[PDB]
Amino acid sequence: DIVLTQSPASLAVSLGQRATISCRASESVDNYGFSFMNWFQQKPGQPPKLLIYAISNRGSGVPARFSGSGSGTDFSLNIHPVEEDDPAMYFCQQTKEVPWTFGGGTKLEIKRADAAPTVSIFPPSSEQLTSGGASVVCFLNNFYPKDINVKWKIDGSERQNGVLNSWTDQDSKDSTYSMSSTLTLTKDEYERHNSYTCEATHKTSTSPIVKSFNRN
Amino acid sequence: EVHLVESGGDLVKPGGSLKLSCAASGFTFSHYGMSWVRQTPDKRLEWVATIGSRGTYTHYPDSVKGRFTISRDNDKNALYLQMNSLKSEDTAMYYCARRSEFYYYGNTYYYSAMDYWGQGASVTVSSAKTTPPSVYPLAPGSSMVTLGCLVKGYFPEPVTVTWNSGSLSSGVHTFPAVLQSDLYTLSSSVTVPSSTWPSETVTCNVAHPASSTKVDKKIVP
Amino acid sequence: EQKLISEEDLN
């Protein structure tokens, strides 16, 4: 086996700037004058797409913004300038011999201006309720950077059980991230207490953004 | 133009078997060698199989060596992947791809450049039972409003969420499902103007192919 | 020149 090491693991670049992802190989991929180095672009929810083949050849429909360079055991992908459409996963594959191994992948994100999250809080649904269930959903949408924190307070006290968090990938239109937090409780445990609060703390402020509701 | 469509994805208990098919079109199938590449939850892509154009030469990585076998029917423009003795580790997204060789300055070389891929076929190897999900609407507690759908207690992945059958695309956020003691759960949120809702309907379409499910929960105030 | 091709155009 010939394993490839991709660096960095992730990357944040402003619009118009240059993005430079590297790929290093175990053994030499050179041969006949070229190298079996290939780059793919995988946007979330989609199958990887061929970007480059044989070190520097662009795939069909791949703009000159993308270029490959390198020889022997060292190669890199270059994107200049970077556009809104690029945030995605990038792998470097080798085909000089079986197995044809893919690099670990490099995540590319657009670096933009900070944005405060838009918080919403939803009470268990009438159905989930008359089923013996109670889940409080809290949405923290379109914010930047990715790093954020949420806390759940019931009648004024943090809670660290029954909470499920899920982040979306960087949006392509507004480069913002979103997160979903869900507090799941029993119907009686829910009717027991009364005031449920969702508390977010983002770099865009020291004062937490809180949203809540009374079971009343 | 070039179109590859996969099928046959499903849940399978360990030691089982599955046969993935890949419908090819928009190019002379018989002139190219196809392949199969799978991707696990950790995102890593792993080449699994490849067959020659005529379908005489085939090869696999020590990974699925002996359990998998690639085949093709050029008369039916189709690629196949038979999987046996399925481990849980084989759970992943399976893609088929066309291969192209290389023309380097006046000579030709086998290259194995996968220039086209199918949408993929999710394959899960787990002893766990198949459970439809529970679809719960999420409306505001008390110029724009955010709504959402809750999808809890289903297995295995995946499920497909949609709002107003695709009419609502922007302002939507469908989050990755989370694993909780052999039961995934995920939510989706859509933000729209207070003008369209509740003045106009807002419904999410969910679907679990693993258990032939398909719920359409209209969100109500 | 550099380009991808079918296995058939290979020989």
Side-chain angles (χ1 to χ4, degrees), chain A residues 35-38 42 48 54 95 98 100 122 139 141 166-167 178-180, chain B residues 39 45 47 99 111-112 117-118 137-139 146 173 175-176 185 187 189:
Chain A
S35 317
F36 299 69
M37 185 58 255
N38 311 118
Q42 178 172 44
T95 47
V98 168
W100 306 313
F122 305 71
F139 291 134
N141 294 170
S166 174
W167 288 253
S178 297
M179 183 194 113
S180 148
Chain B
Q39 180 173 59
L45 291 162
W47 159 68
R99 267 181 45 157
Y111 198 79
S112 190
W117 307 49
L138 282 39
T146 300
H173 288 295
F175 314 70
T185 70
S187 49
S189 90

PDB file of all heavy atoms in Angstrom, chain A residues 35-38 42 48 54 95 98 100 122 139 141 166-167 178-180, chain B residues 39 45 47 99 111-112 117-118 137-139 146 173 175-176 185 187 189:
ATOM      1  N   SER A  35       2.732  11.435 -13.250  1.00  0.00           N
ATOM      2  CA  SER A  35       2.472  10.870 -11.932  1.00  0.00           C
ATOM      3  C   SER A  35       0.985  10.565 -11.847  1.00  0.00           C
ATOM      4  O   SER A  35       0.164  11.348 -12.319  1.00  0.00           O
ATOM      5  CB  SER A  35       2.838  11.876 -10.841  1.00  0.00           C
ATOM      6  OG  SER A  35       4.066  12.514 -11.126  1.00  0.00           O
ATOM      7  N   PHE A  36       0.637   9.438 -11.238  1.00  0.00           N
ATOM      8  CA  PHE A  36      -0.762   9.055 -11.102  1.00  0.00           C
ATOM      9  C   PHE A  36      -1.422   9.737  -9.912  1.00  0.00           C
ATOM     10  O   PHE A  36      -1.958   9.085  -9.019  1.00  0.00           O
ATOM     11  CB  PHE A  36      -0.870   7.540 -10.975  1.00  0.00           C
ATOM     12  CG  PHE A  36      -0.336   6.812 -12.162  1.00  0.00           C
ATOM     13  CD1 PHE A  36       1.027   6.805 -12.430  1.00  0.00           C
ATOM     14  CD2 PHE A  36      -1.200   6.182 -13.048  1.00  0.00           C
ATOM     15  CE1 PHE A  36       1.530   6.184 -13.565  1.00  0.00           C
ATOM     16  CE2 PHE A  36      -0.712   5.555 -14.191  1.00  0.00           C
ATOM     17  CZ  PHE A  36       0.660   5.557 -14.452  1.00  0.00           C
ATOM     18  N   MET A  37      -1.382  11.062  -9.922  1.00  0.00           N
ATOM     19  CA  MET A  37      -1.942  11.870  -8.853  1.00  0.00           C
ATOM     20  C   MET A  37      -3.273  12.445  -9.324  1.00  0.00           C
ATOM     21  O   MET A  37      -3.359  13.018 -10.412  1.00  0.00           O
ATOM     22  CB  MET A  37      -0.951  12.993  -8.513  1.00  0.00           C
ATOM     23  CG  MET A  37      -1.322  13.874  -7.340  1.00  0.00           C
ATOM     24  SD  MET A  37      -1.540  12.902  -5.858  1.00  0.00           S
ATOM     25  CE  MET A  37      -3.351  12.895  -5.716  1.00  0.00           C
ATOM     26  N   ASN A  38      -4.317  12.302  -8.517  1.00  0.00           N
ATOM     27  CA  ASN A  38      -5.617  12.814  -8.922  1.00  0.00           C
ATOM     28  C   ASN A  38      -6.337  13.497  -7.787  1.00  0.00           C
ATOM     29  O   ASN A  38      -6.288  13.032  -6.654  1.00  0.00           O
ATOM     30  CB  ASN A  38      -6.469  11.678  -9.463  1.00  0.00           C
ATOM     31  CG  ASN A  38      -5.728  10.857 -10.474  1.00  0.00           C
ATOM     32  OD1 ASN A  38      -5.508   9.669 -10.279  1.00  0.00           O
ATOM     33  ND2 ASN A  38      -5.319  11.493 -11.560  1.00  0.00           N
ATOM     34  N   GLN A  42     -15.484  16.953  -3.344  1.00  0.00           N
ATOM     35  CA  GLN A  42     -16.753  16.405  -2.892  1.00  0.00           C
ATOM     36  C   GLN A  42     -17.534  17.411  -2.088  1.00  0.00           C
ATOM     37  O   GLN A  42     -17.154  17.771  -0.970  1.00  0.00           O
ATOM     38  CB  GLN A  42     -16.577  15.137  -2.053  1.00  0.00           C
ATOM     39  CG  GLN A  42     -17.932  14.606  -1.558  1.00  0.00           C
ATOM     40  CD  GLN A  42     -17.864  13.237  -0.882  1.00  0.00           C
ATOM     41  OE1 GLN A  42     -16.982  12.978  -0.066  1.00  0.00           O
ATOM     42  NE2 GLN A  42     -18.815  12.366  -1.208  1.00  0.00           N
ATOM     43  N   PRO A  48     -18.128  12.359  -5.082  1.00  0.00           N
ATOM     44  CA  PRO A  48     -16.933  13.132  -5.432  1.00  0.00           C
ATOM     45  C   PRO A  48     -16.894  13.467  -6.935  1.00  0.00           C
ATOM     46  O   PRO A  48     -17.437  12.726  -7.763  1.00  0.00           O
ATOM     47  CB  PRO A  48     -15.782  12.223  -4.980  1.00  0.00           C
ATOM     48  CG  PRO A  48     -16.384  10.854  -4.990  1.00  0.00           C
ATOM     49  CD  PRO A  48     -17.773  11.081  -4.452  1.00  0.00           C
ATOM     50  N   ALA A  54      -3.439  13.171 -13.562  1.00  0.00           N
ATOM     51  CA  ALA A  54      -2.046  13.256 -13.995  1.00  0.00           C
ATOM     52  C   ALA A  54      -1.313  14.519 -13.543  1.00  0.00           C
ATOM     53  O   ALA A  54      -0.612  15.134 -14.337  1.00  0.00           O
ATOM     54  CB  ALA A  54      -1.972  13.148 -15.480  1.00  0.00           C
ATOM     55  N   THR A  95      -3.061   6.460  -8.356  1.00  0.00           N
ATOM     56  CA  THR A  95      -3.444   5.317  -9.180  1.00  0.00           C
ATOM     57  C   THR A  95      -2.243   4.631  -9.796  1.00  0.00           C
ATOM     58  O   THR A  95      -2.382   3.906 -10.782  1.00  0.00           O
ATOM     59  CB  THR A  95      -4.417   5.705 -10.328  1.00  0.00           C
ATOM     60  OG1 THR A  95      -3.935   6.874 -11.009  1.00  0.00           O
ATOM     61  CG2 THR A  95      -5.817   5.936  -9.781  1.00  0.00           C
ATOM     62  N   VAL A  98      -2.404  -0.657  -7.322  1.00  0.00           N
ATOM     63  CA  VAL A  98      -3.453  -1.072  -6.408  1.00  0.00           C
ATOM     64  C   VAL A  98      -2.830  -1.355  -5.039  1.00  0.00           C
ATOM     65  O   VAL A  98      -1.722  -1.891  -4.943  1.00  0.00           O
ATOM     66  CB  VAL A  98      -4.176  -2.349  -6.920  1.00  0.00           C
ATOM     67  CG1 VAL A  98      -5.059  -2.945  -5.816  1.00  0.00           C
ATOM     68  CG2 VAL A  98      -5.019  -2.008  -8.147  1.00  0.00           C
ATOM     69  N   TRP A 100      -5.627   1.718  -5.101  1.00  0.00           N
ATOM     70  CA  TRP A 100      -5.556   3.120  -5.473  1.00  0.00           C
ATOM     71  C   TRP A 100      -6.186   3.864  -4.297  1.00  0.00           C
ATOM     72  O   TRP A 100      -7.404   3.988  -4.197  1.00  0.00           O
ATOM     73  CB  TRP A 100      -6.328   3.354  -6.782  1.00  0.00           C
ATOM     74  CG  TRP A 100      -5.891   2.440  -7.937  1.00  0.00           C
ATOM     75  CD1 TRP A 100      -4.609   2.166  -8.329  1.00  0.00           C
ATOM     76  CD2 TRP A 100      -6.746   1.724  -8.848  1.00  0.00           C
ATOM     77  NE1 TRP A 100      -4.612   1.329  -9.423  1.00  0.00           N
ATOM     78  CE2 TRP A 100      -5.907   1.043  -9.763  1.00  0.00           C
ATOM     79  CE3 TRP A 100      -8.139   1.595  -8.980  1.00  0.00           C
ATOM     80  CZ2 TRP A 100      -6.409   0.245 -10.792  1.00  0.00           C
ATOM     81  CZ3 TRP A 100      -8.640   0.798 -10.009  1.00  0.00           C
ATOM     82  CH2 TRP A 100      -7.771   0.134 -10.902  1.00  0.00           C
ATOM     83  N   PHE A 122     -38.867  25.718  20.093  1.00  0.00           N
ATOM     84  CA  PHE A 122     -40.151  25.069  19.821  1.00  0.00           C
ATOM     85  C   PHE A 122     -40.550  24.061  20.899  1.00  0.00           C
ATOM     86  O   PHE A 122     -39.727  23.274  21.368  1.00  0.00           O
ATOM     87  CB  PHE A 122     -40.098  24.373  18.456  1.00  0.00           C
ATOM     88  CG  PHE A 122     -39.701  25.287  17.323  1.00  0.00           C
ATOM     89  CD1 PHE A 122     -38.397  25.766  17.212  1.00  0.00           C
ATOM     90  CD2 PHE A 122     -40.640  25.699  16.384  1.00  0.00           C
ATOM     91  CE1 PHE A 122     -38.039  26.648  16.179  1.00  0.00           C
ATOM     92  CE2 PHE A 122     -40.288  26.582  15.346  1.00  0.00           C
ATOM     93  CZ  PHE A 122     -38.987  27.055  15.247  1.00  0.00           C
ATOM     94  N   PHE A 139     -33.413  25.941  17.396  1.00  0.00           N
ATOM     95  CA  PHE A 139     -32.607  26.226  16.210  1.00  0.00           C
ATOM     96  C   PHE A 139     -31.727  27.462  16.301  1.00  0.00           C
ATOM     97  O   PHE A 139     -32.220  28.558  16.565  1.00  0.00           O
ATOM     98  CB  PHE A 139     -33.495  26.416  14.983  1.00  0.00           C
ATOM     99  CG  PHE A 139     -34.175  25.169  14.521  1.00  0.00           C
ATOM    100  CD1 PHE A 139     -35.531  25.192  14.190  1.00  0.00           C
ATOM    101  CD2 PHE A 139     -33.458  23.985  14.357  1.00  0.00           C
ATOM    102  CE1 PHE A 139     -36.168  24.058  13.699  1.00  0.00           C
ATOM    103  CE2 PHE A 139     -34.081  22.843  13.867  1.00  0.00           C
ATOM    104  CZ  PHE A 139     -35.443  22.880  13.535  1.00  0.00           C
ATOM    105  N   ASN A 141     -29.570  29.336  13.811  1.00  0.00           N
ATOM    106  CA  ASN A 141     -29.235  29.453  12.403  1.00  0.00           C
ATOM    107  C   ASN A 141     -28.371  30.596  11.888  1.00  0.00           C
ATOM    108  O   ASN A 141     -28.232  31.649  12.514  1.00  0.00           O
ATOM    109  CB  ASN A 141     -30.534  29.421  11.614  1.00  0.00           C
ATOM    110  CG  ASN A 141     -31.230  28.089  11.722  1.00  0.00           C
ATOM    111  OD1 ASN A 141     -32.378  27.934  11.301  1.00  0.00           O
ATOM    112  ND2 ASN A 141     -30.531  27.107  12.277  1.00  0.00           N
ATOM    113  N   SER A 166     -26.649  19.064  16.362  1.00  0.00           N
ATOM    114  CA  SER A 166     -26.288  18.780  14.977  1.00  0.00           C
ATOM    115  C   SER A 166     -25.987  20.032  14.149  1.00  0.00           C
ATOM    116  O   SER A 166     -26.859  20.881  13.948  1.00  0.00           O
ATOM    117  CB  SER A 166     -27.408  17.988  14.296  1.00  0.00           C
ATOM    118  OG  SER A 166     -27.154  17.819  12.909  1.00  0.00           O
ATOM    119  N   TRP A 167     -24.749  20.130  13.665  1.00  0.00           N
ATOM    120  CA  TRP A 167     -24.320  21.256  12.836  1.00  0.00           C
ATOM    121  C   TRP A 167     -24.435  20.944  11.353  1.00  0.00           C
ATOM    122  O   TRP A 167     -24.188  19.815  10.914  1.00  0.00           O
ATOM    123  CB  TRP A 167     -22.864  21.610  13.105  1.00  0.00           C
ATOM    124  CG  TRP A 167     -22.613  22.257  14.399  1.00  0.00           C
ATOM    125  CD1 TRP A 167     -22.314  23.573  14.621  1.00  0.00           C
ATOM    126  CD2 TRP A 167     -22.549  21.608  15.666  1.00  0.00           C
ATOM    127  NE1 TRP A 167     -22.055  23.778  15.954  1.00  0.00           N
ATOM    128  CE2 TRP A 167     -22.193  22.588  16.618  1.00  0.00           C
ATOM    129  CE3 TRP A 167     -22.753  20.289  16.089  1.00  0.00           C
ATOM    130  CZ2 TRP A 167     -22.036  22.289  17.970  1.00  0.00           C
ATOM    131  CZ3 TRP A 167     -22.595  19.992  17.429  1.00  0.00           C
ATOM    132  CH2 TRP A 167     -22.239  20.989  18.357  1.00  0.00           C
ATOM    133  N   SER A 178     -25.244  26.527  10.771  1.00  0.00           N
ATOM    134  CA  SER A 178     -26.466  26.401  11.544  1.00  0.00           C
ATOM    135  C   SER A 178     -26.353  25.208  12.466  1.00  0.00           C
ATOM    136  O   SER A 178     -25.624  24.259  12.186  1.00  0.00           O
ATOM    137  CB  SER A 178     -27.668  26.223  10.631  1.00  0.00           C
ATOM    138  OG  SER A 178     -27.842  27.375   9.825  1.00  0.00           O
ATOM    139  N   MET A 179     -27.062  25.268  13.582  1.00  0.00           N
ATOM    140  CA  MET A 179     -27.024  24.177  14.533  1.00  0.00           C
ATOM    141  C   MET A 179     -28.404  23.901  15.052  1.00  0.00           C
ATOM    142  O   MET A 179     -29.235  24.802  15.164  1.00  0.00           O
ATOM    143  CB  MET A 179     -26.119  24.507  15.707  1.00  0.00           C
ATOM    144  CG  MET A 179     -26.011  23.362  16.677  1.00  0.00           C
ATOM    145  SD  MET A 179     -25.303  23.807  18.251  1.00  0.00           S
ATOM    146  CE  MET A 179     -26.711  23.569  19.330  1.00  0.00           C
ATOM    147  N   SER A 180     -28.641  22.640  15.377  1.00  0.00           N
ATOM    148  CA  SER A 180     -29.926  22.221  15.897  1.00  0.00           C
ATOM    149  C   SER A 180     -29.722  21.511  17.221  1.00  0.00           C
ATOM    150  O   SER A 180     -28.935  20.571  17.307  1.00  0.00           O
ATOM    151  CB  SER A 180     -30.609  21.281  14.904  1.00  0.00           C
ATOM    152  OG  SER A 180     -31.406  20.321  15.570  1.00  0.00           O
TER     153      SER A 180
ATOM    154  N   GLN B  39     -17.836   4.923   0.500  1.00  0.00           N
ATOM    155  CA  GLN B  39     -17.430   5.943   1.458  1.00  0.00           C
ATOM    156  C   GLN B  39     -18.129   5.715   2.789  1.00  0.00           C
ATOM    157  O   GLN B  39     -19.361   5.622   2.858  1.00  0.00           O
ATOM    158  CB  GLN B  39     -17.778   7.326   0.936  1.00  0.00           C
ATOM    159  CG  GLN B  39     -17.398   8.436   1.876  1.00  0.00           C
ATOM    160  CD  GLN B  39     -17.616   9.788   1.250  1.00  0.00           C
ATOM    161  OE1 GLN B  39     -18.735  10.134   0.850  1.00  0.00           O
ATOM    162  NE2 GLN B  39     -16.545  10.561   1.149  1.00  0.00           N
ATOM    163  N   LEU B  45     -12.770   7.873   1.289  1.00  0.00           N
ATOM    164  CA  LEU B  45     -13.165   7.161   0.076  1.00  0.00           C
ATOM    165  C   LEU B  45     -12.273   5.953  -0.096  1.00  0.00           C
ATOM    166  O   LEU B  45     -11.055   6.048   0.056  1.00  0.00           O
ATOM    167  CB  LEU B  45     -13.033   8.065  -1.152  1.00  0.00           C
ATOM    168  CG  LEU B  45     -14.029   9.225  -1.259  1.00  0.00           C
ATOM    169  CD1 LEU B  45     -13.525  10.261  -2.255  1.00  0.00           C
ATOM    170  CD2 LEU B  45     -15.389   8.691  -1.656  1.00  0.00           C
ATOM    171  N   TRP B  47     -11.565   2.792  -2.825  1.00  0.00           N
ATOM    172  CA  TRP B  47     -11.796   2.079  -4.082  1.00  0.00           C
ATOM    173  C   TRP B  47     -12.003   0.619  -3.692  1.00  0.00           C
ATOM    174  O   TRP B  47     -11.211   0.056  -2.933  1.00  0.00           O
ATOM    175  CB  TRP B  47     -10.584   2.210  -5.020  1.00  0.00           C
ATOM    176  CG  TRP B  47     -10.533   1.125  -6.068  1.00  0.00           C
ATOM    177  CD1 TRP B  47     -11.396   0.953  -7.117  1.00  0.00           C
ATOM    178  CD2 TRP B  47      -9.630   0.010  -6.104  1.00  0.00           C
ATOM    179  NE1 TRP B  47     -11.090  -0.202  -7.796  1.00  0.00           N
ATOM    180  CE2 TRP B  47     -10.010  -0.800  -7.196  1.00  0.00           C
ATOM    181  CE3 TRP B  47      -8.538  -0.384  -5.316  1.00  0.00           C
ATOM    182  CZ2 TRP B  47      -9.339  -1.983  -7.521  1.00  0.00           C
ATOM    183  CZ3 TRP B  47      -7.871  -1.566  -5.640  1.00  0.00           C
ATOM    184  CH2 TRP B  47      -8.277  -2.349  -6.735  1.00  0.00           C
ATOM    185  N   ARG B  99     -14.313   4.669 -15.819  1.00  0.00           N
ATOM    186  CA  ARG B  99     -12.862   4.821 -15.785  1.00  0.00           C
ATOM    187  C   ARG B  99     -12.423   5.265 -17.161  1.00  0.00           C
ATOM    188  O   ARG B  99     -13.019   4.879 -18.163  1.00  0.00           O
ATOM    189  CB  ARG B  99     -12.162   3.486 -15.536  1.00  0.00           C
ATOM    190  CG  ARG B  99     -11.850   3.144 -14.117  1.00  0.00           C
ATOM    191  CD  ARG B  99     -11.130   1.809 -14.095  1.00  0.00           C
ATOM    192  NE  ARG B  99     -10.091   1.739 -15.123  1.00  0.00           N
ATOM    193  CZ  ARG B  99      -9.041   0.925 -15.066  1.00  0.00           C
ATOM    194  NH1 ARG B  99      -8.890   0.111 -14.034  1.00  0.00           N
ATOM    195  NH2 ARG B  99      -8.132   0.938 -16.025  1.00  0.00           N
ATOM    196  N   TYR B 111      -4.887   4.242 -16.756  1.00  0.00           N
ATOM    197  CA  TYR B 111      -4.772   5.237 -15.721  1.00  0.00           C
ATOM    198  C   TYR B 111      -5.756   5.046 -14.597  1.00  0.00           C
ATOM    199  O   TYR B 111      -5.427   5.266 -13.441  1.00  0.00           O
ATOM    200  CB  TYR B 111      -4.968   6.619 -16.316  1.00  0.00           C
ATOM    201  CG  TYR B 111      -4.451   7.680 -15.403  1.00  0.00           C
ATOM    202  CD1 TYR B 111      -3.082   7.951 -15.336  1.00  0.00           C
ATOM    203  CD2 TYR B 111      -5.307   8.350 -14.529  1.00  0.00           C
ATOM    204  CE1 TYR B 111      -2.577   8.856 -14.422  1.00  0.00           C
ATOM    205  CE2 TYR B 111      -4.806   9.255 -13.611  1.00  0.00           C
ATOM    206  CZ  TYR B 111      -3.442   9.499 -13.568  1.00  0.00           C
ATOM    207  OH  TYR B 111      -2.940  10.404 -12.689  1.00  0.00           O
ATOM    208  N   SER B 112      -6.974   4.654 -14.944  1.00  0.00           N
ATOM    209  CA  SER B 112      -8.017   4.429 -13.960  1.00  0.00           C
ATOM    210  C   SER B 112      -8.506   5.751 -13.368  1.00  0.00           C
ATOM    211  O   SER B 112      -8.554   5.921 -12.147  1.00  0.00           O
ATOM    212  CB  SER B 112      -7.492   3.500 -12.855  1.00  0.00           C
ATOM    213  OG  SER B 112      -8.533   3.076 -11.991  1.00  0.00           O
ATOM    214  N   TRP B 117     -19.486   9.718 -11.630  1.00  0.00           N
ATOM    215  CA  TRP B 117     -20.022   8.917 -10.522  1.00  0.00           C
ATOM    216  C   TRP B 117     -21.549   8.943 -10.421  1.00  0.00           C
ATOM    217  O   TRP B 117     -22.201   9.915 -10.814  1.00  0.00           O
ATOM    218  CB  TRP B 117     -19.439   9.405  -9.193  1.00  0.00           C
ATOM    219  CG  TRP B 117     -17.951   9.478  -9.182  1.00  0.00           C
ATOM    220  CD1 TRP B 117     -17.146  10.053 -10.125  1.00  0.00           C
ATOM    221  CD2 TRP B 117     -17.081   8.957  -8.179  1.00  0.00           C
ATOM    222  NE1 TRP B 117     -15.829   9.919  -9.771  1.00  0.00           N
ATOM    223  CE2 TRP B 117     -15.759   9.248  -8.578  1.00  0.00           C
ATOM    224  CE3 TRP B 117     -17.289   8.268  -6.978  1.00  0.00           C
ATOM    225  CZ2 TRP B 117     -14.649   8.875  -7.823  1.00  0.00           C
ATOM    226  CZ3 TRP B 117     -16.184   7.895  -6.222  1.00  0.00           C
ATOM    227  CH2 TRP B 117     -14.880   8.202  -6.651  1.00  0.00           C
ATOM    228  N   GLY B 118     -22.109   7.851  -9.906  1.00  0.00           N
ATOM    229  CA  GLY B 118     -23.546   7.763  -9.704  1.00  0.00           C
ATOM    230  C   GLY B 118     -23.855   8.505  -8.413  1.00  0.00           C
ATOM    231  O   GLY B 118     -22.934   8.922  -7.703  1.00  0.00           O
ATOM    232  N   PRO B 137     -44.149  17.777  13.896  1.00  0.00           N
ATOM    233  CA  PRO B 137     -44.072  19.160  13.410  1.00  0.00           C
ATOM    234  C   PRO B 137     -43.527  20.087  14.486  1.00  0.00           C
ATOM    235  O   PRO B 137     -43.694  19.824  15.676  1.00  0.00           O
ATOM    236  CB  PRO B 137     -45.522  19.482  13.062  1.00  0.00           C
ATOM    237  CG  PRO B 137     -46.265  18.745  14.113  1.00  0.00           C
ATOM    238  CD  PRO B 137     -45.551  17.397  14.143  1.00  0.00           C
ATOM    239  N   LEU B 138     -42.866  21.161  14.065  1.00  0.00           N
ATOM    240  CA  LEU B 138     -42.298  22.136  14.995  1.00  0.00           C
ATOM    241  C   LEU B 138     -42.756  23.532  14.616  1.00  0.00           C
ATOM    242  O   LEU B 138     -42.241  24.119  13.668  1.00  0.00           O
ATOM    243  CB  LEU B 138     -40.768  22.094  14.961  1.00  0.00           C
ATOM    244  CG  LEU B 138     -39.992  20.996  15.691  1.00  0.00           C
ATOM    245  CD1 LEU B 138     -40.699  19.662  15.568  1.00  0.00           C
ATOM    246  CD2 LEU B 138     -38.582  20.918  15.105  1.00  0.00           C
ATOM    247  N   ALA B 139     -43.728  24.059  15.349  1.00  0.00           N
ATOM    248  CA  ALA B 139     -44.232  25.401  15.080  1.00  0.00           C
ATOM    249  C   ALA B 139     -43.796  26.336  16.209  1.00  0.00           C
ATOM    250  O   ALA B 139     -43.449  25.881  17.302  1.00  0.00           O
ATOM    251  CB  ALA B 139     -45.749  25.377  14.961  1.00  0.00           C
ATOM    252  N   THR B 146     -39.580  30.874  11.570  1.00  0.00           N
ATOM    253  CA  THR B 146     -38.856  29.631  11.358  1.00  0.00           C
ATOM    254  C   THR B 146     -39.692  28.453  11.840  1.00  0.00           C
ATOM    255  O   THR B 146     -40.294  28.503  12.916  1.00  0.00           O
ATOM    256  CB  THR B 146     -37.521  29.626  12.113  1.00  0.00           C
ATOM    257  OG1 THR B 146     -36.712  30.719  11.658  1.00  0.00           O
ATOM    258  CG2 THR B 146     -36.781  28.323  11.865  1.00  0.00           C
ATOM    259  N   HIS B 173     -32.792  24.136   6.409  1.00  0.00           N
ATOM    260  CA  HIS B 173     -31.638  23.567   7.079  1.00  0.00           C
ATOM    261  C   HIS B 173     -32.001  22.172   7.582  1.00  0.00           C
ATOM    262  O   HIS B 173     -32.767  22.019   8.533  1.00  0.00           O
ATOM    263  CB  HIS B 173     -31.189  24.460   8.250  1.00  0.00           C
ATOM    264  CG  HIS B 173     -30.526  25.739   7.825  1.00  0.00           C
ATOM    265  ND1 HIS B 173     -29.326  25.765   7.145  1.00  0.00           N
ATOM    266  CD2 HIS B 173     -30.898  27.033   7.983  1.00  0.00           C
ATOM    267  CE1 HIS B 173     -28.987  27.021   6.903  1.00  0.00           C
ATOM    268  NE2 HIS B 173     -29.923  27.809   7.402  1.00  0.00           N
ATOM    269  N   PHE B 175     -30.423  19.029   9.207  1.00  0.00           N
ATOM    270  CA  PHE B 175     -29.214  18.633   9.906  1.00  0.00           C
ATOM    271  C   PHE B 175     -28.894  17.145   9.904  1.00  0.00           C
ATOM    272  O   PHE B 175     -29.782  16.297   9.804  1.00  0.00           O
ATOM    273  CB  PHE B 175     -29.271  19.128  11.360  1.00  0.00           C
ATOM    274  CG  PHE B 175     -29.723  20.566  11.506  1.00  0.00           C
ATOM    275  CD1 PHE B 175     -31.039  20.932  11.240  1.00  0.00           C
ATOM    276  CD2 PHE B 175     -28.829  21.549  11.928  1.00  0.00           C
ATOM    277  CE1 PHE B 175     -31.455  22.251  11.394  1.00  0.00           C
ATOM    278  CE2 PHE B 175     -29.235  22.872  12.084  1.00  0.00           C
ATOM    279  CZ  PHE B 175     -30.549  23.226  11.818  1.00  0.00           C
ATOM    280  N   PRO B 176     -27.599  16.813  10.022  1.00  0.00           N
ATOM    281  CA  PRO B 176     -27.123  15.430  10.051  1.00  0.00           C
ATOM    282  C   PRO B 176     -27.820  14.689  11.192  1.00  0.00           C
ATOM    283  O   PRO B 176     -28.034  15.250  12.271  1.00  0.00           O
ATOM    284  CB  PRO B 176     -25.629  15.587  10.310  1.00  0.00           C
ATOM    285  CG  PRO B 176     -25.312  16.866   9.636  1.00  0.00           C
ATOM    286  CD  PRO B 176     -26.462  17.749  10.048  1.00  0.00           C
ATOM    287  N   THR B 185     -31.728  10.226  14.842  1.00  0.00           N
ATOM    288  CA  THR B 185     -32.709  11.298  14.968  1.00  0.00           C
ATOM    289  C   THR B 185     -32.129  12.548  14.298  1.00  0.00           C
ATOM    290  O   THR B 185     -30.938  12.848  14.443  1.00  0.00           O
ATOM    291  CB  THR B 185     -33.032  11.632  16.463  1.00  0.00           C
ATOM    292  OG1 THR B 185     -31.897  12.255  17.075  1.00  0.00           O
ATOM    293  CG2 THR B 185     -33.386  10.368  17.244  1.00  0.00           C
ATOM    294  N   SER B 187     -33.401  16.686  12.524  1.00  0.00           N
ATOM    295  CA  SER B 187     -34.432  17.699  12.368  1.00  0.00           C
ATOM    296  C   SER B 187     -34.163  18.496  11.120  1.00  0.00           C
ATOM    297  O   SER B 187     -33.094  18.392  10.530  1.00  0.00           O
ATOM    298  CB  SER B 187     -34.413  18.649  13.563  1.00  0.00           C
ATOM    299  OG  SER B 187     -33.092  19.105  13.810  1.00  0.00           O
ATOM    300  N   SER B 189     -35.257  22.552   9.446  1.00  0.00           N
ATOM    301  CA  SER B 189     -35.907  23.824   9.729  1.00  0.00           C
ATOM    302  C   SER B 189     -35.991  24.624   8.452  1.00  0.00           C
ATOM    303  O   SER B 189     -35.100  24.559   7.609  1.00  0.00           O
ATOM    304  CB  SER B 189     -35.121  24.632  10.757  1.00  0.00           C
ATOM    305  OG  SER B 189     -34.169  25.471  10.130  1.00  0.00           O
TER     306      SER B 189
END
